[PDB]
Amino acid sequence: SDNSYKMDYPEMGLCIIINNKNWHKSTGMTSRSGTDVDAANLRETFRNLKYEVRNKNDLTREEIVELMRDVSKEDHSKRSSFVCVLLSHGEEGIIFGTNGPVDLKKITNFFRGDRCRSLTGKPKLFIIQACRGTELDCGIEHKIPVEADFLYAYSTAPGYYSWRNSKDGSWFIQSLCAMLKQYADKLEFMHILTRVNRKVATEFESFSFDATFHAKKQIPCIVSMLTKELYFYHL
């Protein structure tokens, strides 16, 4: 004889997809038509990125908690990264099981750098397709921190609805999979997510017979505590 995460472990890692479509009637909540299109698109996208995909459908709040604790209890030592995709109803800081809410913080805390040791120092990606409130965008014209190496890719800005098309699937996941497919062999992940932002911002606008919900816009929200650049191709 180091600005990029080491991505040449023998496995890229797990990609957990939680696909909630049908709600218990007592919740008063409605179904999420189009979400199966999202989950299949996601399965195929991360398969090509060489992630071991596990799809889970219609999980209660206790099933979501149990699943994530279990997955965080696995030995990830031969994996480069961890990906969890949440497709559901939600509001700010919260995603819904089929029978009630789960705090996003309770989910992600299982993977803290001190609680999931085989993922310490490795990128932990949470992709969240869910509302974060009820605002509508009308548009115009030695040690490391335990919260380090998380990336949260939210579908929408804080406080806002997130949009889903009943036959094409959600705006964000649509755009995410398309940008991953076109650019994962070319761009660093932040720059890919920036393309996702532009795609959603420019190419989608809501159509509704209800004037309150018509002609509305969306911008996704990248939240990064990453300490290095993330590439899906290597050498």
């Binding site: 999420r32 397709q129 509302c131 609805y161 949009w163 889903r164 098309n165 009943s166 959600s170 919900f213």
Partner: peptide
């Protein structure tokens, strides 16, 4: 188009 629907909201989540």
């Amino acid at each position: 188009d629907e909201v989540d």
